[PDB]
Amino acid sequence: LFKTETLTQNCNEILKRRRHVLVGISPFNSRFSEDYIHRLIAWAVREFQSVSVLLAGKEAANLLEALGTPHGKAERKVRKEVSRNRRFAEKALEAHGGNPEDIHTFSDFANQTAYRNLRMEVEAAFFDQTHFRNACLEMSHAAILVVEVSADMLELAVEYVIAELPFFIAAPDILGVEETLLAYHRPWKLGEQISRNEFAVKMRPNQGYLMVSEA
């Protein structure tokens, strides 16, 4: 009951093998009602050998702060929303035979070698390469989406993009799985640019991007 489109042909090859999908669930996004989460997870468990879930880490507060939410309140709001996201994912995983413990936020690995190494690569590109930095700021703009979005707002919001990107380029390094697709319902423009080798940053050969749409 879901249609799929892959980012590259290599992504499609991973898709065909059905080993693992990493289901992205983002906070304060209206797509992620309890019922949608249940349907999406049911689909994932049916289609793939293994299913894991990715939630927003601490940097989600930056998105709120960029919109004028005081930092203290922003941190509490994120904790509430992410804990809610988790509870829905846990319930859905349990119900369909998945593992409720296979739910991670992008902050859970701050002290892990694999994650840190990927953060370093992304940060180096961000500071070194104007083209990559601009693409990231644009990604962070999308993450925030009448308030006018300012440069200062994006400089705050972009920490979110930097913190999550390791899971978009090499989640298997971090999670220890053989290969995966990050599944999400929006297109990923930065990923399109990454796939055309426009940046120092590369998507790993065992990482794909899967855009899912209700059928």
Curated annotation (Swiss-Prot):
Keyword Repressor applies:
no
Summarizing the annotation, the consequence of altering K77A is: Strong decrease of L-leucyl-tRNA(Leu) binding, but moderate decrease in the cyclodileucine synthase activity
Check the record and name the Pfam families matching this protein: CDPS
**What EC class is this?**
transferase
Q: Which InterPro entries match?
A: CDPS, CDPS_sf
What are the record keywords, sorted? Transferase
- A GO biological process this protein is involved in? pigment biosynthetic process
Q: Where is this site: Could have a critical role in the catalytic mechanism?
A: N29, E164
Please state the Enzyme Commission number of this protein: 2.3.2.22
Listed GO MF terms:
aminoacyltransferase activity
Q: List the active site.
A: S26 (nucleophile)
List of residues binding substrate: N29, Y160, V161, I162, A163, E164, Y184, K189, L190
Spell out the reaction equation it catalyses: 2 L-leucyl-tRNA(Leu) = cyclo(L-leucyl-L-leucyl) + 2 tRNA(Leu) + 2 H(+)
User: Residues at site: Could be involved in aa-tRNA binding?
Assistant: K77, R87, Y160
Relate the outcome reported for changing E164A.
Answer: It is able to bind L-leucyl-tRNA(Leu), but has almost no cyclodileucine synthase activity
What changing N29D does, per the record, is: It is able to bind L-leucyl-tRNA(Leu), but has almost no cyclodileucine synthase activity
Q: How does it assemble?
A: Monomer.
Function noted in UniProt: Involved in the biosynthesis of pulcherrimin, a red extracellular pigment. It uses activated amino acids in the form of aminoacyl-tRNAs (aa-tRNAs) as substrates to catalyze the ATP-independent formation of cyclodipeptides which are intermediates in diketopiperazine (DKP) biosynthetic pathways. Catalyzes the formation of cyclo(L-Leu-L-Leu) (cLL) from L-leucyl-tRNA(Leu). Can also incorporate various nonpolar residues, such as L-phenylalanine, L-leucine and methionine, into cyclodipeptides.
Entry similarity comment: Belongs to the CDPS family.
* Protein name (database record): Cyclo(L-leucyl-L-leucyl) synthase
**Annotated organism of origin:** Bacillus licheniformis (strain ATCC 14580 / DSM 13 / JCM 2505 / CCUG 7422 / NBRC 12200 / NCIMB 9375 / NCTC 10341 / NRRL NRS-1264 / Gibson 46)
Specify the taxonomic lineage: Bacteria, Bacillati, Bacillota, Bacilli, Bacillales
Q: Which gene encodes it?
A: yvmC
